[PDB]
Amino acid sequence: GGPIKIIDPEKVSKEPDALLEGFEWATLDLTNETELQELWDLLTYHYVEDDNAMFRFRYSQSFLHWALMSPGWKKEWHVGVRATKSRKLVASICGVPTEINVRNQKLKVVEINFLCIHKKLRSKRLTPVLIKEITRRCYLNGIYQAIYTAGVVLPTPVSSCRYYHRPLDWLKLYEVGFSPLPAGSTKARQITKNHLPSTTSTPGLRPMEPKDIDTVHDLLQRYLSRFALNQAFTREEVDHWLVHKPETVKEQVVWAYVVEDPETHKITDFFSFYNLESTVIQNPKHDNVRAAYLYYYATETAFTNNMKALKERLLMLMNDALILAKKAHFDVFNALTLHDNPLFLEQLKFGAGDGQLHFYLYNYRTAPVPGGVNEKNLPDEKRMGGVGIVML
Numbered sequence: 001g002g003p004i005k006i007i008d009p010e011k012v013s014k015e016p017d018a019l020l021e022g023f024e025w026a027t028l029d030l031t032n033e034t035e036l037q038e039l040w041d042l043l044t045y046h047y048v049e050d051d052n053a054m055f056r057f058r059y060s061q062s063f064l065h066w067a068l069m070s071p072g073w074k075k076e077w078h079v080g081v082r083a084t085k086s087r088k089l090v091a092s093i094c095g096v097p098t099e100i101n102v103r104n105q106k107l108k109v110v111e112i113n114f115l116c117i118h119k120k121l122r123s124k125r126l127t128p129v130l131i132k133e134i135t136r137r138c139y140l141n142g143i144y145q146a147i148y149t150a151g152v153v154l155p156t157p158v159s160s161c162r163y164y165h166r167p168l169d170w171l172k173l174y175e176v177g178f179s180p181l182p183a184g185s186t187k188a189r190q191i192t193k194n195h196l197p198s199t200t201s202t203p204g205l206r207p208m209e210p211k212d213i214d215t216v217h218d219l220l221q222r223y224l225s226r227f228a229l230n231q232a233f234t235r236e237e238v239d240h241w242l243v244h245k246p247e248t249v250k251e252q253v254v255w256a257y258v259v260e261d262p263e264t265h266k267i268t269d270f271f272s273f274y275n276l277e278s279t280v281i282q283n284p285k286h287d288n289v290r291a292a293y294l295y296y297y298a299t300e301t302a303f304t305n306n307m308k309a310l311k312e313r314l315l316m317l318m319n320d321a322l323i324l325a326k327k328a329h330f331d332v333f334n335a336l337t338l339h340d341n342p343l344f345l346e347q348l349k350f351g352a353g354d355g356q357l358h359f360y361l362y363n364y365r366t367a368p369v370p371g372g373v374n375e376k377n378l379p380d381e382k383r384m385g386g387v388g389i390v391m392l
């Protein structure tokens, strides 16, 4: 495929379009703690809810710092709208730069995230106005393509993936209304079903350390290249997205583990997962669901091109991930059908979700890509090799 249109740099407007009366554009400076707070206040009460109004995503301030100030980031791409009189932040749309591979073409893009409109300004056609203004701001900086995911269907998706959920603390997920009691069964039998080992089983598995950066970078890129659509990681991005920094990050967001070969001492696998709570909206017993999401991972056994061998190693690596997540007090472990994940989701007892994530490319045309599912929307080993990028 290829780009849909060429942008004339000389016709990109210097000033933004007009906004609804009483409102004005504002560039957010998220190094300023009050503005980061303002953004957190908007998202906490106005961001992504499920269709039953039971859970709302609760990105923490530390997550946002991490997600929005990654290598190459520009404040010009953190876009707000404020009420002119109260100065209150009522809408947002953000991007960060990265490079992607789309069928062996390498593309400079922005990843678009955190589109949010205060509930009281909904249904006023403000979204197209947000979208068009961040577009202009990117165009001024020499970026002309974007990638994004959404829960809703818009023109020409590149792929689609289903959410899966492996219960770590089943009872709490039972009390919040998330997990069913099905149907001639017992709390105890469900806890039994979900009970995990207390120690990990992969030989040489330890926490990732800064010294592992170069070797993990190399393994990740090799693995990711087995996917038609992937993130082309830099060294700095491996550092930023995978290596938690104790001294500077007060609330930990990223968790990475490597597999040091007991004999050769070369890293042969790694996996990672991040922390993203949901607010439980109307609930007596509980306030908070603590969720871990599967992130990037890689394994040398994938290059043996033996699908049975890969299944074996992933079944073991991922079950250690569950055990480690449980140990860090997470209530549920979430994954999508992207990567080689259909090889293990069901067998490790993830239950199919109702959530769907659709993937989009702006100003770039390419043939559809497999999302790990089939025409019944259930995991399928023949339908992988497509989506290799995970977006927050």
Ligand SMILES: CCCCCCCCCCCCCC(=O)SCCNC(=O)CCNC(=O)[C@H](O)C(C)(C)COP(=O)(O)OP(=O)(O)OC[C@H]1O[C@@H](n2cnc3c(N)ncnc32)[C@H](O)[C@@H]1OP(=O)(O)O
Binding pocket: 046, 047, 048, 049, 110, 112, 113, 114, 115, 116, 117, 118, 121, 122, 123, 124, 125, 126, 127, 128, 131, 134, 135, 138, 139, 143, 144, 145, 146, 148, 149, 150, 151, 152, 154, 362
């Ligand atoms: C090179 C640079 C390119 C840069 C940009 C590339 C493109 C980036 C694209 C943005 C990627 C975002 C990535 C994420 O962050 S996805 C996260 C989206 N956020 C939420 O779901 C949070 C809760 N919801 C809301 O805040 C509002 O409902 C939102 C803001 C979602 C809609 O507000 P509202 O409900 O007040 O609607 P409206 O009256 O203003 O506008 C109606 C129009 O908006 C279109 N719509 C609805 N949902 C989405 C959606 N998720 N992506 C794109 N478009 C969407 C819809 O087709 C309709 O168009 P049409 O019916 O006229 O055809």
Ligand SMILES: Cc1ccnc(C)c1COc1c(Cl)cc(-c2ccnc(N3CCNCC3)c2)cc1Cl
Binding pocket: 048, 049, 050, 051, 055, 056, 057, 149, 150, 151, 152, 163, 165, 178, 278, 289, 291, 334, 353, 354, 355, 356, 391, 392
């Ligand atoms: C199990 C659970 C726990 C906490 N919150 C939700 C919504 C759920 C329900 O499953 C969903 C459902 Cl139904 C929907 C989404 C969802 C939908 C639309 N957009 C997203 N985004 C999050 C990723 N970036 C793009 C926007 C997530 C995500 C999940 Cl994890």
